[PDB]
Design an enzyme around this catalytic site. Structure first.
Site, mmCIF file in Angstrom:
data_model
loop_
_atom_site.group_PDB
_atom_site.id
_atom_site.type_symbol
_atom_site.label_atom_id
_atom_site.label_comp_id
_atom_site.label_asym_id
_atom_site.label_seq_id
_atom_site.Cartn_x
_atom_site.Cartn_y
_atom_site.Cartn_z
ATOM 1 N N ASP A 64 0.796 -1.226 0.000
ATOM 2 C CA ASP A 64 0.000 0.000 0.000
ATOM 3 C C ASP A 64 0.832 1.282 0.000
ATOM 4 O O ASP A 64 0.279 2.370 0.223
ATOM 5 C CB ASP A 64 -1.031 0.001 1.141
ATOM 6 C CG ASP A 64 -0.403 0.083 2.533
ATOM 7 O OD1 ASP A 64 0.837 0.188 2.678
ATOM 8 O OD2 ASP A 64 -1.191 0.013 3.484
ATOM 9 N N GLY A 86 -9.921 2.498 1.369
ATOM 10 C CA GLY A 86 -10.546 3.397 2.327
ATOM 11 C C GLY A 86 -11.106 2.647 3.524
ATOM 12 O O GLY A 86 -11.704 1.578 3.363
ATOM 13 N N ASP A 88 -9.611 0.852 5.672
ATOM 14 C CA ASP A 88 -8.919 -0.357 6.095
ATOM 15 C C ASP A 88 -7.906 -0.052 7.196
ATOM 16 O O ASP A 88 -7.283 1.011 7.228
ATOM 17 C CB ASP A 88 -8.237 -1.033 4.897
ATOM 18 C CG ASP A 88 -9.239 -1.536 3.862
ATOM 19 O OD1 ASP A 88 -10.462 -1.326 4.049
ATOM 20 O OD2 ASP A 88 -8.791 -2.163 2.882
ATOM 21 N N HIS A 90 -4.549 -1.542 9.283
ATOM 22 C CA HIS A 90 -3.403 -2.433 9.186
ATOM 23 C C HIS A 90 -2.607 -2.369 10.479
ATOM 24 O O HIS A 90 -2.290 -1.281 10.966
ATOM 25 C CB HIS A 90 -2.506 -1.995 8.028
ATOM 26 C CG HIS A 90 -3.190 -2.053 6.699
ATOM 27 N ND1 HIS A 90 -2.654 -1.506 5.555
ATOM 28 C CD2 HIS A 90 -4.384 -2.578 6.341
ATOM 29 C CE1 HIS A 90 -3.477 -1.711 4.540
ATOM 30 N NE2 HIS A 90 -4.535 -2.360 4.991
ATOM 31 N N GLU A 93 2.731 -6.452 12.145
ATOM 32 C CA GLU A 93 2.958 -7.756 12.751
ATOM 33 C C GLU A 93 4.290 -7.832 13.484
ATOM 34 O O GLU A 93 4.486 -8.735 14.301
ATOM 35 C CB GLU A 93 2.853 -8.860 11.695
ATOM 36 C CG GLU A 93 2.888 -10.257 12.306
ATOM 37 C CD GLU A 93 1.704 -10.503 13.216
ATOM 38 O OE1 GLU A 93 0.602 -10.721 12.672
ATOM 39 O OE2 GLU A 93 1.864 -10.451 14.461
ATOM 40 N N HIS A 112 -7.957 3.234 18.509
ATOM 41 C CA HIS A 112 -7.309 4.363 17.847
ATOM 42 C C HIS A 112 -7.434 4.249 16.327
ATOM 43 O O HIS A 112 -7.816 5.214 15.643
ATOM 44 C CB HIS A 112 -5.835 4.403 18.263
ATOM 45 C CG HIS A 112 -5.061 5.534 17.666
ATOM 46 N ND1 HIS A 112 -4.863 6.723 18.334
ATOM 47 C CD2 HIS A 112 -4.436 5.656 16.472
ATOM 48 C CE1 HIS A 112 -4.129 7.527 17.582
ATOM 49 N NE2 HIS A 112 -3.865 6.906 16.443
ATOM 50 N N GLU A 113 -7.104 3.075 15.773
ATOM 51 C CA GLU A 113 -7.068 2.953 14.318
ATOM 52 C C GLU A 113 -8.459 3.026 13.708
ATOM 53 O O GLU A 113 -8.637 3.640 12.653
ATOM 54 C CB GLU A 113 -6.336 1.684 13.885
ATOM 55 C CG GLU A 113 -4.861 1.706 14.258
ATOM 56 C CD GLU A 113 -4.084 2.886 13.658
ATOM 57 O OE1 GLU A 113 -4.477 3.413 12.611
ATOM 58 O OE2 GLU A 113 -3.037 3.262 14.265
ATOM 59 N N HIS A 116 -9.393 6.496 13.108
ATOM 60 C CA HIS A 116 -8.953 6.986 11.803
ATOM 61 C C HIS A 116 -9.828 6.438 10.679
ATOM 62 O O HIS A 116 -10.142 7.160 9.725
ATOM 63 C CB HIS A 116 -7.498 6.606 11.524
ATOM 64 C CG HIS A 116 -6.498 7.312 12.383
ATOM 65 N ND1 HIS A 116 -6.521 8.670 12.612
ATOM 66 C CD2 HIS A 116 -5.412 6.839 13.040
ATOM 67 C CE1 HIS A 116 -5.502 9.000 13.390
ATOM 68 N NE2 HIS A 116 -4.810 7.905 13.659
ATOM 69 N N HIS A 122 -5.932 13.355 15.073
ATOM 70 C CA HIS A 122 -5.336 13.230 16.394
ATOM 71 C C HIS A 122 -5.796 14.317 17.359
ATOM 72 O O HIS A 122 -6.264 15.385 16.963
ATOM 73 C CB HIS A 122 -3.814 13.213 16.290
ATOM 74 C CG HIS A 122 -3.289 11.921 15.757
ATOM 75 N ND1 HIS A 122 -2.199 11.840 14.915
ATOM 76 C CD2 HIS A 122 -3.737 10.651 15.923
ATOM 77 C CE1 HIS A 122 -1.986 10.571 14.603
ATOM 78 N NE2 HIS A 122 -2.902 9.831 15.208
HETATM 79 C C1 B9Z Z 1 -5.143 4.486 24.913
HETATM 80 O O1 B9Z Z 1 -4.802 5.627 24.157
HETATM 81 C C2 B9Z Z 1 -4.136 5.377 22.951
HETATM 82 C C3 B9Z Z 1 -3.472 6.417 22.338
HETATM 83 C C4 B9Z Z 1 -2.812 6.198 21.142
HETATM 84 C C5 B9Z Z 1 -2.801 4.942 20.552
HETATM 85 C C6 B9Z Z 1 -2.075 4.727 19.233
HETATM 86 C C7 B9Z Z 1 -1.353 5.754 18.636
HETATM 87 C C8 B9Z Z 1 -0.703 5.515 17.427
HETATM 88 C C9 B9Z Z 1 -0.794 4.267 16.826
HETATM 89 S S1 B9Z Z 1 0.006 3.887 15.247
HETATM 90 C C10 B9Z Z 1 1.290 5.131 14.988
HETATM 91 C C11 B9Z Z 1 2.350 5.184 15.884
HETATM 92 C C12 B9Z Z 1 3.353 6.119 15.713
HETATM 93 C C13 B9Z Z 1 3.270 6.997 14.646
HETATM 94 C C14 B9Z Z 1 2.214 6.937 13.754
HETATM 95 C C15 B9Z Z 1 1.198 6.014 13.923
HETATM 96 C C16 B9Z Z 1 0.008 5.934 12.943
HETATM 97 C C17 B9Z Z 1 0.222 6.817 11.702
HETATM 98 C C18 B9Z Z 1 1.255 6.217 10.746
HETATM 99 C C19 B9Z Z 1 1.476 7.106 9.522
HETATM 100 O O2 B9Z Z 1 1.029 8.286 9.514
HETATM 101 O O3 B9Z Z 1 2.103 6.656 8.527
HETATM 102 C C20 B9Z Z 1 -1.313 6.348 13.590
HETATM 103 O O4 B9Z Z 1 -1.334 7.363 14.315
HETATM 104 O O5 B9Z Z 1 -2.376 5.691 13.372
HETATM 105 C C21 B9Z Z 1 -1.509 3.256 17.423
HETATM 106 C C22 B9Z Z 1 -2.150 3.487 18.624
HETATM 107 C C23 B9Z Z 1 -3.473 3.895 21.164
HETATM 108 C C24 B9Z Z 1 -4.136 4.119 22.364
HETATM 109 CA CA CA Z 2 3.685 -10.075 15.981
HETATM 110 CA CA CA Z 3 -12.198 -0.543 2.611
HETATM 111 ZN ZN ZN Z 4 -0.854 -0.628 5.323
HETATM 112 ZN ZN ZN Z 5 -3.137 7.857 14.840
#
Ligand code: B9Z
Ligand code: CA
Ligand code: CA
Ligand code: ZN
Ligand code: ZN
Ligand code: CA
Length: 157
Positions: A64, A86, A88, A90, A93, A112-113, A116, A122
């Site tokens: 992707d 759109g 999805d 990921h 792993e 969190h995901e 999005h 954010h």
């Molecule tokens: C309880 O409260 C929580 C607070 C935050 C979270 C939390 C935050 C972040 C990620 S993943 C991530 C990590 C570092 C940089 C960028 C990303 C991607 C964006 C990647 C990109 O832009 O290419 C993103 O923000 O989704 C997952 C989970 C979970 C619980």
């Molecule tokens: Ca793993």
């Molecule tokens: Ca989709």
């Molecule tokens: Zn991906």
């Molecule tokens: Zn995020």
């Protein structure tokens, strides 16, 4: 954009070997419930055909143009509402996905995901689930912040 319907399907493309399948299923289902509890959205898991939100576990480059980075750093990512890729979500792993302690909690990351996936960005509130930095929080007391609720209700309320 936002989803222009309130019945949204998801499908688990593949399972991380880090966790029992039942626990992957439960973490994902509960994560969607977090958002359906504060919106009129309904989420349904499907097991065949094309879903709106495809849940993928993948490491490194996975087709992707947004390759993951090994353990740590970027834990996951998700695309905003739209056709095809759109919506999805990921999950890297190379993280160790967990239910209770250690690694990176799948339920909290999925909340969190999916945020999005639904169109949220954010938050500046460290208590918000949409805060940019993951930290483990007590899942027994887990609650969306006022900012999370304001954001999702501005889109779907
Ligand atoms: C309880 O409260 C929580 C607070 C935050 C979270 C939390 C935050 C972040 C990620 S993943 C991530 C990590 C570092 C940089 C960028 C990303 C991607 C964006 C990647 C990109 O832009 O290419 C993103 O923000 O989704 C997952 C989970 C979970 C619980
Ligand atoms: Ca793993
Ligand atoms: Ca989709
Ligand atoms: Zn991906
Ligand atoms: Zn995020
Ligand atoms: Ca990573």
């Amino acid at each position: 954009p936002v989803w222009r319907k309130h019945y949204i399907t998801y499908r688990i493309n593949n399972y991380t070997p880090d966790m029992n399948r039942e626990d992957v299923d439960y973490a994902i289902r509960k994560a969607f419930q977090v958002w359906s509890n504060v919106t009129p959205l309904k989420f349904s898991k499907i097991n065949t055909g094309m879903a709106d939100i495809l849940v993928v576990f993948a490491r490194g480059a996975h087709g992707d143009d947004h390759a993951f980075d090994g353990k740590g750093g970027i834990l996951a990512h998700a695309f905003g509402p739209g056709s095809g890729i759109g919506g999805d979500a990921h999950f890297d792993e190379d993280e160790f996905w967990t239910t209770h302690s250690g690694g990176t909690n799948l339920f909290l990351t999925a909340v969190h995901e999916i945020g999005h996936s639904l169109g949220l960005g954010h938050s500046s509130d460290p208590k918000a689930v949409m805060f940019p930095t993951y930290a483990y929080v007590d899942i027994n007391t887990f609650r969306l912040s006022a900012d999370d609720i304001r954001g999702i209700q501005s889109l779907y309320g």
